[PDB]
Amino acid sequence: VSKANVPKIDVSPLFGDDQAAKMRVAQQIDAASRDTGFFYAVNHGINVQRLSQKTKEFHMSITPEEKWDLAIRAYNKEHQDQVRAGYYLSIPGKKAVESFCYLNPNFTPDHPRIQAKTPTHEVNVWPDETKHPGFQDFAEQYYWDVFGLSSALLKGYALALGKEENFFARHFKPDDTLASVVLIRYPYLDPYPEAAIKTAADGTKLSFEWHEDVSLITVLYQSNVQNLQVETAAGYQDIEADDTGYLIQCGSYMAHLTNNYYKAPIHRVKWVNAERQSLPFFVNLGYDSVIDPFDPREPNGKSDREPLSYGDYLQNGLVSLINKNGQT
Ligand SMILES: CC(C)[C@@H](NC(=O)[C@H](CS)NC(=O)CCC[C@H](N)C(=O)O)C(=O)O
Numbered sequence: 006v007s008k009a010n011v012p013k014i015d016v017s018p019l020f021g022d023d024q025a026a027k028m029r030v031a032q033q034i035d036a037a038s039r040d041t042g043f044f045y046a047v048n049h050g051i052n053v054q055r056l057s058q059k060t061k062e063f064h065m066s067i068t069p070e071e072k073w074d075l076a077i078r079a080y081n082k083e084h085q086d087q088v089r090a091g092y093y094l095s096i097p098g099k100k101a102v103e104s105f106c107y108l109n110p111n112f113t114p115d116h117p118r119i120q121a122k123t124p125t126h127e128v129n130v131w132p133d134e135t136k137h138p139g140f141q142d143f144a145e146q147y148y149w150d151v152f153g154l155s156s157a158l159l160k161g162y163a164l165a166l167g168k169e170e171n172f173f174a175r176h177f178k179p180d181d182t183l184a185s186v187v188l189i190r191y192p193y194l195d196p197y198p199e200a201a202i203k204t205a206a207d208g209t210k211l212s213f214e215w216h217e218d219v220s221l222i223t224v225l226y227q228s229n230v231q232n233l234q235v236e237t238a239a240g241y242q243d244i245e246a247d248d249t250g251y252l253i254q255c256g257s258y259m260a261h262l263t264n265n266y267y268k269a270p271i272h273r274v275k276w277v278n279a280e281r282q283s284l285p286f287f288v289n290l291g292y293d294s295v296i297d298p299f300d301p302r303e304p305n306g307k308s309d310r311e312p313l314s315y316g317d318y319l320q321n322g323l324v325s326l327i328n329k330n331g332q333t
């Protein structure tokens with residue numbers, strides 16, 4: 006197995022007002038998006054030390070009673086409104102991974118998409134504050150911290166594609182974004198149940214099979230345990246870990262709108278018997294957000310692809326990913 010070229014890109018100019026410096030970042034984003042599809046965003050300004058600590062505290066202290074109380078509909082039939090947000094239970098002996106997903110904190114009973122019962126919109130569920138002191142505050146502030154980073158990254162992608170810097174970010178708004186955070190725990194287990202391990206066609210032992218991300222882009226923090234592989238024409242290649250940077254990749258919505266100029270990289274999660282964290286932020290737009298496709302390889306830049314409403318794209322993609330790679 007070879008190693009993927011995953012460049013470290015100093016993204017800090019994307020927060021600034023040096024427009025030529027932004028273009029140099031954009032070129033690096035362009036080059037990485039045309040190569041393996043992944044890059045590490047460094048000099049990002051987010052305190053990832055606190056993120057990994059608050060996450061470990063929550064995963065290690067939440068009780069089986071609380072997990073049922075917060076469980077999504079897939080694990081608790083009483084919670085029919087929890088399709089996306091809530092706790093995703095492990096199944097000892099069968100499924101090792103467990104996780105907690107939350108959405109836009111502005112999704113409240115006051116929000117018109119909640120009032121309208123629009124799919125993919127939900128009010129977050131939270132554990133008891135006294136049992137998990139500071140957790141909800143930490144989680145909500147992290148959502149907006151990574152929202153700010155993601156907004157800047159979207160400026161880099163827009164410039165990289167020859168557009169004005171707000172081409173994507175104008176659709177990425179705190180009042181309506183369908184973006185989600187998932188706090189994933191991959192446990193150490195002795196013995197590790199083979200029923201929780203999948204075998205790839207090439208024989209690799211996996212925790213999660215190949216897929217493209219359902220997102221515009223995905224902004225991922227992981228603890229320092231190598232596990233990810235990206236597919237290339239020459240086969241799967243290891244993505245090296247980096248527990249200070251954010252692993253950035255395009256989702257299938259970006260592949261659609263760029264006429265596959267920026268592919269959504271196919272990737273998978275190797276089985277590793279080690280305690281670790283995987284904290285993705287899925288950069289999703291608004292339910293009615295529509296981006297007109299274009300082709301940066303055509304002289305006229307014209308694409309025949311249909312503009313896709315993001316909400317319908319998200320609803321179809323999340324169900325499809327569950328059908329193909331299992332309920333997480
Ligand atoms: C590849 C990693 C990001 C991670 N996998 C994942 O997060 C996988 C594949 S991208 N993602 C999903 O299943 C979709 C979660 C969507 C979320 N519940 C929501 O409603 O928005 C892993 O470490 O397993």
Ligand SMILES: [Fe+3]
Pocket residue numbers: 216217218272
């Ligand atoms: Fe993924």
